[PDB]
């Protein structure tokens, strides 16, 4: 990164830990939380990487950086699946029509049984890839699949733990 600012290892540790908990604490399910925050997170993450490059092997800073990277990876991956679920549910809502009447109704997803098989596979792939972020995966993608289940009757492993 192009910068002349210099930071101590203590300052570098503080910045990295602040960003890690900020990301892990923010509610990922609300889209506006990620849309508004990610621009600020990306600017900070670039600065954190530059100042923590010497301390990648450090016993305290190193683990923080590794967790921070993993959290950002999980944040982007989970947001992608829930974005597609939101697309499916909004296609379904538009199909209901104006006022629910069906008056000016859009055409209704035809491969919905198959689009629900795609999402559930993605959900399970996220669970395996990010084993230490299940609480966040369930907050975003898990709950998203529970909403879809109310529209289409499909089977996924955690369906019973979502009251289905």
């Amino acid at each position: 990164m192009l910068t002349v600012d210099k930071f101590t290892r203590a300052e570098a540790l503080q910045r990295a830990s602040n960003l890690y908990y900020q990301v892990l604490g923010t509610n990922w399910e609300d889209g506006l939380n990620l849309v508004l925050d990610v621009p600020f997170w990306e600017s900070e993450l670039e600065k954190v990487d530059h100042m923590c490059e010497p301390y990648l092997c450090d016993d305290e800073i190193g683990p923080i950086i590794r967790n921070l990277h993993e959290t950002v990876n999980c944040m982007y991956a989970c947001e992608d699946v829930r974005d597609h679920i939101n697309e499916l549910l909004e296609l379904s809502s538009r199909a209901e029509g104006v006022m629910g009447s069906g008056a000016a109704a859009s055409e209704e997803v035809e491969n919905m049984p198959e689009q629900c098989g795609m999402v559930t596979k993605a959900y399970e792939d996220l669970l395996a890839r990010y084993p230490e972020h299940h609480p966040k995966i369930e907050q975003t993608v898990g709950h998203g699949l529970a909403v879809l289940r109310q529209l289409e009757k499909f089977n996924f492993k955690s369906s019973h733990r979502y009251f289905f």
Binding site: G25, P135, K157, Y162, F164
Partner: protein, 259 residues
């Protein structure tokens, strides 16, 4: 001879839902609406489907929409008149069959608030009940009687629009019940989690939740108190607190949880 129009949907035919009119003699029927529905099922059309257990208003299973306003059929009175009594499922809910709603989202949202007492120290051996004064117990008076009928939920215009993001009146009142319980020691954690634009501040004070509550509770007042407490007690470090609790739930099973 009252006329009762009832919403009907077959999950298999998947034909457009319709209102079917039945005629019942109130002389041979119980005063409450649920009695009329049972009589219709027993005599005329046994296909009619509806949830009912307690018959005394306590289970919270007979929540329906009667003549426009949500309520429990077992406590609702039949009001004879020329106008047909219209009975429909709970508003803006997915209908599994006839008058049986799909309240799975409501159950999941409740599991999210983690409604169980949390303490930092495990009960020491040789310890009796955790101390609570009569005055402290009085604080939890109007909040612990909620039967989860889900009427207040399906009467909020804000839950109609954003069902999967807004926790809803009933869940929010239950969250205040655990934020107000002197015995709970995770007050700050609960307030930090609930302090979200979608979860809490989607309540615009319509007051439909308090008007339709079958148990006479005031979910609207509780949400107002919870918003005032959060605003006064907010600290910059709350976000970190939420993150740390999320790390503590890392090994939990697959279901809604604090995160």
């Amino acid at each position: 001879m009252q006329t009762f129009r009832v919403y009907r949907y077959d999950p298999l035919l998947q034909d457009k839902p319709h209102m079917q009119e039945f005629n019942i003699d109130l002389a041979q029927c119980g005063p409450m609406i649920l009695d009329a529905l049972i009589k219709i099922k027993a005599t005329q059309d046994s296909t009619l489907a509806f949830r009912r257990s307690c018959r005394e208003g306590i289970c919270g299973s007979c929540a329906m929409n009667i003549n426009g306003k949500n309520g429990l059929a077992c406590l609702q009175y039949i009001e004879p008149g020329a106008a047909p009594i219209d009975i429909q499922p709970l508003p803006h809910t997915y209908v599994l069959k006839d008058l049986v709603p799909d309240l799975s989202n409501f159950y999941n949202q409740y599991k999210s608030i983690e409604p169980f007492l949390k303490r930092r120290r495990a009960k020491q051996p040789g310890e009796k009940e955790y101390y609570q004064s009569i005055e402290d117990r009085e604080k939890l008076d109007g909040m612990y009687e909620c039967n989860l009928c889900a009427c207040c939920m399906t009467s909020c215009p804000s839950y109609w629009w954003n069902p999967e993001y807004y926790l809803g009146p009933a869940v929010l009142l239950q969250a205040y019940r655990w934020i107000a319980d002197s015995r709970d020691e995770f007050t700050t954690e609960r307030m930090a989690w609930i302090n979200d634009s979608m979860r809490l501040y989607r309540c615009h004070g319509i007051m439909n939740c308090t008007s339709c509550c079958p148990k006479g509770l005031d979910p609207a007042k509780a949400i107002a108190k919870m918003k005032a407490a959060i605003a006064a007690a907010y600290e910059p470090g709350w976000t970190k607190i939420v993150a740390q609790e999320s790390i503590a739930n890392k090994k939990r099973e697959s279901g809604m949880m604090y995160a």
